[PDB]
Write a protein that binds this ligand. Sequence first.
Ligand SMILES: C=CC1=C(C)/C(=C/c2[nH]c(/C=C3N=C(/C=C4\NC(=O)C(C)=C4C=C)C(C)=C\3CCC(=O)O)c(CCC(=O)O)c2C)NC1=O
Ligand SMILES: *[C@@H]1O[C@H](CO)[C@@H](O[C@@H]2O[C@H](CO)[C@@H](O)[C@H](O)[C@H]2NC(C)=O)[C@H](O)[C@H]1NC(C)=O
Ligand SMILES: *[C@@H]1O[C@H](CO)[C@@H](O[C@@H]2O[C@H](CO)[C@@H](O)[C@H](O)[C@H]2NC(C)=O)[C@H](O)[C@H]1NC(C)=O
Ligand SMILES: *[C@@H]1O[C@H](CO)[C@@H](O)[C@H](O)[C@H]1NC(C)=O
Ligand SMILES: *[C@@H]1O[C@H](CO)[C@@H](O)[C@H](O)[C@H]1NC(C)=O
Ligand SMILES: *[C@@H]1O[C@H](CO)[C@@H](O)[C@H](O)[C@H]1NC(C)=O
Ligand SMILES: *[C@@H]1O[C@H](CO)[C@@H](O)[C@H](O)[C@H]1NC(C)=O
Ligand SMILES: *[C@@H]1O[C@H](CO)[C@@H](O)[C@H](O)[C@H]1NC(C)=O
Ligand SMILES: *[C@@H]1O[C@H](CO)[C@@H](O)[C@H](O)[C@H]1NC(C)=O
Lengths: 285, 49, 49
Amino acid sequence: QCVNLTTRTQLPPAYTNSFTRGVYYPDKVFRSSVLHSTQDLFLPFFSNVTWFHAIHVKRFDNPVLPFNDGVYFASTEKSNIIRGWIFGTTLDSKTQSLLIVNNATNVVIKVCEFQFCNDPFLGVYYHKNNKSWMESEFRVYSSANNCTFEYVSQPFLMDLEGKQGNFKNLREFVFKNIDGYFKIYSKHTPINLVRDLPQGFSALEPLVDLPIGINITRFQTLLALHRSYLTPGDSSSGWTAGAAAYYVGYLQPRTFLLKYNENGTITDAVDCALDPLSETKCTLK
Amino acid sequence: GVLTESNKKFLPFQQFGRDIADTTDAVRDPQTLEILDITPCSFGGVSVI
Amino acid sequence: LYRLFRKSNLKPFERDISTEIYQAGSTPCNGVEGFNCYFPLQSYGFQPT
Ligand SMILES: C=CC1=C(C)/C(=C/c2[nH]c(/C=C3N=C(/C=C4\NC(=O)C(C)=C4C=C)C(C)=C\3CCC(=O)O)c(CCC(=O)O)c2C)NC1=O
Ligand SMILES: *[C@@H]1O[C@H](CO)[C@@H](O[C@@H]2O[C@H](CO)[C@@H](O)[C@H](O)[C@H]2NC(C)=O)[C@H](O)[C@H]1NC(C)=O
Ligand SMILES: *[C@@H]1O[C@H](CO)[C@@H](O[C@@H]2O[C@H](CO)[C@@H](O)[C@H](O)[C@H]2NC(C)=O)[C@H](O)[C@H]1NC(C)=O
Ligand SMILES: *[C@@H]1O[C@H](CO)[C@@H](O)[C@H](O)[C@H]1NC(C)=O
Ligand SMILES: *[C@@H]1O[C@H](CO)[C@@H](O)[C@H](O)[C@H]1NC(C)=O
Ligand SMILES: *[C@@H]1O[C@H](CO)[C@@H](O)[C@H](O)[C@H]1NC(C)=O
Ligand SMILES: *[C@@H]1O[C@H](CO)[C@@H](O)[C@H](O)[C@H]1NC(C)=O
Ligand SMILES: *[C@@H]1O[C@H](CO)[C@@H](O)[C@H](O)[C@H]1NC(C)=O
Ligand SMILES: *[C@@H]1O[C@H](CO)[C@@H](O)[C@H](O)[C@H]1NC(C)=O
């Protein structure tokens, strides 16, 4: 049932500065009022991250991106447009692939041999009769066989109505694939910023530790399409994109100096060997 | 050691707490979900005249 | 069954269930067996004797 999307306007990729962003708790041990030095896969400080923004004004982006030893993925949203990811190597059913999706009722995590579509997306439909939205289209994969791991979350419902105004939610993720474990660290913050990544500090907490045992080198973000009476044409053109943005950076093996405050929260950090001053801060602790 | 009541608020994914010397200070009691601080029970200098 | 041919060694706790034809030689195999084109999986022959 998959259909390609044709009404697109190509643009060069944008780049943004990540300012002391993408720190996570390295272990599950409580530490308070301490300067702890650790070495792990971190997003380097003051680092250039690729920016993909889906707007109509139609400019929307969901390309297949590399997965270089881990990914930091930020998403600024107001209407729940970015709703999952695809991970794998070839994404063509010759190899196993991982699918994380929130389809507005459940969060599904499947490691399975998917025959993925060239333009995978989900789709919500505007109703003029009553002011209500319902998710209608699920065009992620064509077939699924030999289907190893599966988790389905408890049922829910989320506000998939298209909001108008400013971005409100910032959802930050760190994905890494170590020793057969896909580790996800997550953090949601409320914001009121319009365009770029917020400037500040927020530490990502461990969420999952999925035992998938999958080689992962490429990944692709899954977005949601509004379809309305105001959008004419067939399924390939009769659609519009809600305003949302996401940012992708890549983790590197780095030494960090984390500061745990009196309540056990990582409030600040120093990216060691960023600049010589940071090295001095490391040595002095 | 000596186990005492704690004001520390563990995150749900944490079970232990440690000094900068990596020795365990606080532990979440697995039966009753409360935090208990652990203190060495030997302390204080002693001299013989 | 066990995998007898692979292009590279597995990572720890990694699973590979793909059944693509292994190109032992230089010419591509194009999804069919033949000379220097092996099915990667082979079955154990388990007999009680
Ligand atoms: C994609 C997989 C996915 C993950 C990993 C996820 C994590 C996650 N999101 C949550 C809240 C939530 N998460 C969302 C929606 C999202 N948050 C996101 O990161 C994304 C992509 C969406 C979908 C667009 C909403 C609406 C809430 C509730 C916020 C509220 O209280 O209003 C919670 C807290 C649930 C609780 O209260 O017990 C978790 C654990 N949610 C997901 O859907
Ligand atoms: C979102 O995904 C889940 C899992 O695919 C769907 O839940 C399943 O739906 C099928 C068909 O109705 C049932 O056979 C299963 O029992 C359901 N499993 C559950 C609830 O755990 C769900 O329907 C999807 N929701 C939307 C809006 O697409
Ligand atoms: C994990 O996936 C990547 C991509 O398939 C594999 O790397 C490729 O290996 C073949 C071997 O001939 C090369 O031709 C490709 O150029 C490689 N591509 C990249 C991006 O590296 C890798 O071998 C796989 N790792 C394991 C353990 O299976
Ligand atoms: C277009 O769709 C067909 C099948 O739906 C697919 O084979 C093809 O790869 C798609 N092309 C692009 C550019 O998406
Ligand atoms: C890397 O960061 C610099 C800013 O210092 C930016 O100009 C550049 O665009 C980024 N890299 C790429 C490929 O854009
Ligand atoms: C009300 O909204 C739902 C989904 O949003 C739709 O299925 C239904 O048709 C609407 N009711 C009427 C009378 O159109
Ligand atoms: C993979 O799928 C094919 C076709 O269904 C089947 O022959 C094969 O046994 C499957 N292998 C595994 C490990 O499931
Ligand atoms: C730590 O938690 C207490 C709540 O009892 C709060 O009053 C205090 O502000 C918190 N400390 C910091 C630095 O946020
Ligand atoms: C038994 O387990 C429950 C937690 O499910 C706990 O509340 C309770 O304290 C335990 N019983 C005793 C005697 O501790």
